[PDB]
Amino acid sequence: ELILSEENKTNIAVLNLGTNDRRNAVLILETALHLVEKYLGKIINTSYLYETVPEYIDVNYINELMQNLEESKYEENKELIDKCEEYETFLKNGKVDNSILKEVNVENYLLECNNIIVKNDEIMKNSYFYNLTVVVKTFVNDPLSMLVVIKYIEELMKRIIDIDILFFNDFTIFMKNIKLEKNMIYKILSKYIHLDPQEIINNMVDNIEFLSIPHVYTTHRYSILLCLNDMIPEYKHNVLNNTIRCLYNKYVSRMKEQYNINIKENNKRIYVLKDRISYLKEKTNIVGILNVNYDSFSDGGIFVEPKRAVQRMFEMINEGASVIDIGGESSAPFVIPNPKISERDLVVPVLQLFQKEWNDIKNKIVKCDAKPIISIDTINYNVFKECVDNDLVDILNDISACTNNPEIIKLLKKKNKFYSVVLMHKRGNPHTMDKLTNYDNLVYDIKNYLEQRLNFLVLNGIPRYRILFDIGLGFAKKHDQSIKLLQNIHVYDEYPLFIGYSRKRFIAHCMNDQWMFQMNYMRKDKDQLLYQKNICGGLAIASYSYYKKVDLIRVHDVLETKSVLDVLTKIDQVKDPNSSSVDKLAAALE
Amino acid sequence: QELILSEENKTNIAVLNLGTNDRRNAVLILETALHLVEKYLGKIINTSYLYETVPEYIDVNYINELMQNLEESKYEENKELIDKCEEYETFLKNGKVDNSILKEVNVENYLLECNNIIVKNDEIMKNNSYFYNLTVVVKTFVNDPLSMLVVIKYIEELMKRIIDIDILFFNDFTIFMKNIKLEKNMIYKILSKYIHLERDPQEIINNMVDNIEFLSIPHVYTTHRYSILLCLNDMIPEYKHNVLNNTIRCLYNKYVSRMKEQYNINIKENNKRIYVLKDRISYLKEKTNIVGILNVNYEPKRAVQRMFEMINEGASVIDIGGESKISERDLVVPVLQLFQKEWNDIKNKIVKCDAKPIISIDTINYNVFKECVDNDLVDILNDISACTNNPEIIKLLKKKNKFYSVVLMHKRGNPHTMDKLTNYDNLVYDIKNYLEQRLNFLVLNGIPRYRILFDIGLGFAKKHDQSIKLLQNIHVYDEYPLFIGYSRKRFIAHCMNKDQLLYQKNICGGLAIASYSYYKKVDLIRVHDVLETKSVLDVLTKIDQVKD
Numbered sequence A: 001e002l003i004l005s006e007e008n009k010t011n012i013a014v015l016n017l018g019t020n021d022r023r024n025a026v027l028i029l030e031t032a033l034h035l036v037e038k039y040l041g042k043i044i045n046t047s048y049l050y051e052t053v054p055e056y057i058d059v060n061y062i063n064e065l066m067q068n069l070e071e072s073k074y075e076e077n078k079e080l081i082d083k084c085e086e087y088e089t090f091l092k093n094g095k096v097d098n099s100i101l102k103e104v105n106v107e108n109y110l111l112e113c114n115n116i117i118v119k120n121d122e123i124m125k126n127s128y129f130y131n132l133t134v135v136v137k138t139f140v141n142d143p144l145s146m147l148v149v150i151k152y153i154e155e156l157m158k159r160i161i162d163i164d165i166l167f168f169n170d171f172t173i174f175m176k177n178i179k180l181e182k183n184m185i186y187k188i189l190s191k192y193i194h195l196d197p198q199e200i201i202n203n204m205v206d207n208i209e210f211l212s213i214p215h216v217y218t219t220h221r222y223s224i225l226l227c228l229n230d231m232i233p234e235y236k237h238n239v240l241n242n243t244i245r246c247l248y249n250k251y252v253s254r255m256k257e258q259y260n261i262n263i264k265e266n267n268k269r270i271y272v273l274k275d276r277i278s279y280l281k282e283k284t285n286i287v288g289i290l291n292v293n294y295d296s297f298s299d300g301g302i303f304v305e306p307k308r309a310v311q312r313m314f315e316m317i318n319e320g321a322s323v324i325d326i327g328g329e330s331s332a333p334f335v336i337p338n339p340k341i342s343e344r345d346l347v348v349p350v351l352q353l354f355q356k357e358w359n360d361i362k363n364k365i366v367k368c369d370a371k372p373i374i375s376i377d378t379i380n381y382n383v384f385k386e387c388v389d390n391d392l393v394d395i396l397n398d399i400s401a402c403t404n405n406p407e408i409i410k411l412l413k414k415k416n417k418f419y420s421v422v423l424m425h426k427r428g429n430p431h432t433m434d435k436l437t438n439y440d441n442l443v444y445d446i447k448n449y450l451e452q453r454l455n456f457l458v459l460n461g462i463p464r465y466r467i468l469f470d471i472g473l474g475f476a477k478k479h480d481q482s483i484k485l486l487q488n489i490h491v492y493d494e495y496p497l498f499i500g501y502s503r504k505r506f507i508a509h510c511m512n513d514q515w516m517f518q519m520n521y522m523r524k525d526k527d528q529l530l531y532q533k534n535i536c537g538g539l540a541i542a543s544y545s546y547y548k549k550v551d552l553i554r555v556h557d558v559l560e561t562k563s564v565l566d567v568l569t570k571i572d573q574v575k576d577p578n579s580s581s582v583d584k585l586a587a588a589l590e
Numbered sequence B: 001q002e003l004i005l006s007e008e009n010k011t012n013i014a015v016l017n018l019g020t021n022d023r024r025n026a027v028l029i030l031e032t033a034l035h036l037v038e039k040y041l042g043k044i045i046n047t048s049y050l051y052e053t054v055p056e057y058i059d060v061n062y063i064n065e066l067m068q069n070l071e072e073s074k075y076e077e078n079k080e081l082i083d084k085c086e087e088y089e090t091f092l093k094n095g096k097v098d099n100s101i102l103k104e105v106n107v108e109n110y111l112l113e114c115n116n117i118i119v120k121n122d123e124i125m126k127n128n129s130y131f132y133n134l135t136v137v138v139k140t141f142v143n144d145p146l147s148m149l150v151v152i153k154y155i156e157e158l159m160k161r162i163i164d165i166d167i168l169f170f171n172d173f174t175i176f177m178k179n180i181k182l183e184k185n186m187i188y189k190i191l192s193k194y195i196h197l198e199r200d201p202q203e204i205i206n207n208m209v210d211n212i213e214f215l216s217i218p219h220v221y222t223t224h225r226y227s228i229l230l231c232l233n234d235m236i237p238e239y240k241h242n243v244l245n246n247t248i249r250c251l252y253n254k255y256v257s258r259m260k261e262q263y264n265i266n267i268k269e270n271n272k273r274i275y276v277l278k279d280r281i282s283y284l285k286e287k288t289n290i291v292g293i294l295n296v297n298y299e300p301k302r303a304v305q306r307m308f309e310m311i312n313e314g315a316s317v318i319d320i321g322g323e324s325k326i327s328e329r330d331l332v333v334p335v336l337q338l339f340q341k342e343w344n345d346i347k348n349k350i351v352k353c354d355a356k357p358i359i360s361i362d363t364i365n366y367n368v369f370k371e372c373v374d375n376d377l378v379d380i381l382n383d384i385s386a387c388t389n390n391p392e393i394i395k396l397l398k399k400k401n402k403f404y405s406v407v408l409m410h411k412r413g414n415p416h417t418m419d420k421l422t423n424y425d426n427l428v429y430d431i432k433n434y435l436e437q438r439l440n441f442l443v444l445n446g447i448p449r450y451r452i453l454f455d456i457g458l459g460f461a462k463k464h465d466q467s468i469k470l471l472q473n474i475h476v477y478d479e480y481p482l483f484i485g486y487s488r489k490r491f492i493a494h495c496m497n498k499d500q501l502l503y504q505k506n507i508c509g510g511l512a513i514a515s516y517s518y519y520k521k522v523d524l525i526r527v528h529d530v531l532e533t534k535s536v537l538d539v540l541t542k543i544d545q546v547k548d
């Protein structure tokens, strides 16, 4: 057929990825993402991950499968891109080539989809879901060939994974009765892959019964609209009454007006720090600060002490940190800048020792749940690479928001493995930043900036749910501006949020004059009071952060922060949510 | 004489309004008014909160010298505690009392003559700042409202825009006398029935002749000014006089929603509830004050150093206790004496008079408080038994001129039985009702409602989850001046998942409760760690402050 014509083509597909395994959602779904990157094209958009309920309310397999992967007949191009013309035109939505497969008209499509909806409704009369959408700049020719490959991808992994096609360019397709020859399937597969591997094919004939573009359930299932609203809010297919955002909002409002259900509440947005699910805005996590320079040189010393540094790492884990943020800068520890020690030499030994010391005192199989996520405050591609290659780190914390070296973004993807990234807003360096303070609209300039970085990383296949925002308190902000940023923190209610107020100069600015600091050298009695005040002022920001549902706070003082967060969590922990009005009523009757 | 100066002594119920213009001395003006009322009219058996009021559309050393040279009342003062007042119960019902000696009018005529006063005064105000308001119930020995108005006007002249006292009610009576002309010597004769006359009495009696033109019971504006209804709602919400549509509460509620419906303004916004710690106005729910804990155990000199440290670290109030073998007296009195010496020795800055902390004494011992009060050493009684241990202590909350404030805390048992007395049918409301009952008892005994502070007593006869539950439900006190002490208590540790470690976690858990208290607008918090608490409160205050 025209299906097999070897003239190279660039198509835009939109996929849905589903699983119901809570514990392994991330590994399952990220495995599927990578086989889609490998066997289909380039991932150029992702939604958040979502824990979904229906609208009314086995692992070692994978790790071994990655070695025995059949090669693609197309080479995957890791190169960074700034835009993508085909995607820009898919959104317009401008003139593309005619569909290879036969297209149905709007009316017939709708009727065919409605049939499937009512027929499946009757069957269900005779669960937690984990959902994610993706956009693929695809080299595959047509929706059906893609479905054949999708089916193969599924079978390589096998209800553990369900991959659907939601859109494929601007086409409207309904194909009724699909009889596929095991030899026609092979020719499609061999068109894209360097090919028992026959039982796989035999399973597929039964599987592809029909084909629907857009997918049947596209506007009917909230979870799909929910995902598509992150990626392509303004998009309008010929088959839909309105744009994706407009459809999504109507669903939310109608569910509210007609059934008195808040559909948002049952359908949770997820971010991923490492390998497990985190529910957006459901926990304030403590990130422990380990500054190697401060640990070593601030008392007057001239040598790095990796042991002392690793002692502090364990002290933080015990004090209640979930994440450790480790950083160094290239510094000259003598009077003359004559000899100096590199960032690599500051951070990698400490990371190496921590990893060694972890694998020892872990003697029981049980103490591995207690393993902190590891974040590295670096803008250096080489530092990050050695960390990632020797499995020393989980998260890139990039205070330039990946603008120092955008190639650092390539190191956030391996094959199977994805790493998470913090992007922070700043201007200049520590020497210049205090003067770089003019903003046309402080709150929204920083937000738009961070949003643009996200769009860039998302365009290059960094999964949306792995990107965290940091407003960079104290970095090119006057003290009143750091305060204004906190005042307007709600502006990040849709996003994973990572902040760092700890011990910054704007805290002292909140005090009018009208032991929590462990001393490195002897400061005066008057300076000790000021440090107490600052760490306490910080604990006030922890409280504020707690109530504002900030996802991650970066602190020097873990024990103190944890104490605060434990007490606020307890106060919020209520057994019976209406017992307040029930007890009140009982008193009124008494 | 005419049965107006009838020799028979009766007991009537009067409801008064007390108003002033001056914010700075409001408390003093009004409490001087209060004391003269206790002196000259009968017994105060109820009071409203103090209120800051904006009208419906959109120096003081004289007083201190006045209080020395007051004519004695011919009627007697009785400080014994009462449990009930039948005359007052009769007024509330409203059951049968003696016939009004003053000619009454019917509902129809009263309403006409009121509207008439309204329209004539609406016209002069159309031909043309802040008010401080308080109401009281007096069980009076004065025979009739006109006599009462005569004595009221004497009080007003003694104090002389400064003070304005009105009769809101006087039993069940309805009275509208249109043209009052009173002889100079009839005024003397009324005043002489109630007050042992002979300073400069002849000339003030001249002033009063001009002053009484008419008499309206109920007062013309009773139902027509928000500030009057606001006050009365505190005291007598279920009261229904013959001349009113419904009860005071209903009349209050209907005035509130009417301002919302017809004008889109929350009337509550510019009409603020006040409580008083020492001598100044505090706006309810507008500041979380820090109370520094001074626990005395053994040196006076070191303790007084700790006090000065706390003042500088930002404590508004110091709360001193010895009672948690030298006596409680011997622990706390010398410290408080030394403090007051040391404070007076630094008169090197004459302008620090409002830099002085309010002093609170944690005691249930009458003898200790008696010595504190006699020697002007304290401002506030912090009674952890809510004055149930020795209710005679309530007598010490009034000197002639002066009123003292009081914290009423809830507990059960003593420090050794406490932990076992933990059963409650309805924890949050049991404690609330208990504190309301205690408040009702002091208010009945003439303690200003606005000087009474509530403490849920965290950790006293509460399991840890109960202490938490009390915090979770702190909103229950949104109407009340609230004082809480969580600091270093055992339940803080209950929230968490080498020995200076637990000490740290406790202080920091305390700082979490400081944050919560701030957002829940708790009026006073009792802490060991003043600097730390102040740092939290300053930061949270900055974040809340939007300036343009």
Ligand SMILES: Nc1ncnc2c1ncn2[C@@H]1O[C@H](COP(=O)(O)OP(=O)(O)OP(=O)(O)O)[C@@H](O)[C@H]1O
Pocket (backbone or CB within 6 Å): B019, B149, B164, B165, B166, B167, B168, B211, B212, B213, B214, B215, B216, B217, B218, B219, B220, B221
């Ligand atoms: N129940 C009452 N209490 C006090 N004064 C009254 C009463 N009924 C009538 N009056 C008269 O109202 C007149 C005005 O009194 P004044 O201006 O001193 O205070 P007021 O107007 O009663 O106070 P407010 O402005 O709060 O109503 C006086 O001549 C007084 O005799």
Ligand SMILES: Nc1ncnc2c1ncn2[C@@H]1O[C@H](COP(=O)(O)O)[C@@H](O)[C@H]1O
Pocket (backbone or CB within 6 Å): A147, A162, A163, A164, A165, A166, A207, A208, A209, A210, A211, A212, A213, A214, A215, A216
């Ligand atoms: N756009 C589409 N994407 C994925 N599957 C589809 C689509 N249109 C039709 N199908 C069919 O839907 C059926 C049910 O799929 P599943 O629910 O994954 O078992 C299969 O027979 C698919 O061939």
Ligand SMILES: [Ca+2]
Pocket (backbone or CB within 6 Å): B037, B038, B039, B041, B042, B043, B044, B076, B077, B078
């Ligand atoms: Ca009296």
Ligand SMILES: [Mg+2]
Pocket (backbone or CB within 6 Å): A162, A163, A164
């Ligand atoms: Mg499917």
Ligand SMILES: [Mg+2]
Pocket (backbone or CB within 6 Å): B164, B165, B166
């Ligand atoms: Mg008056």
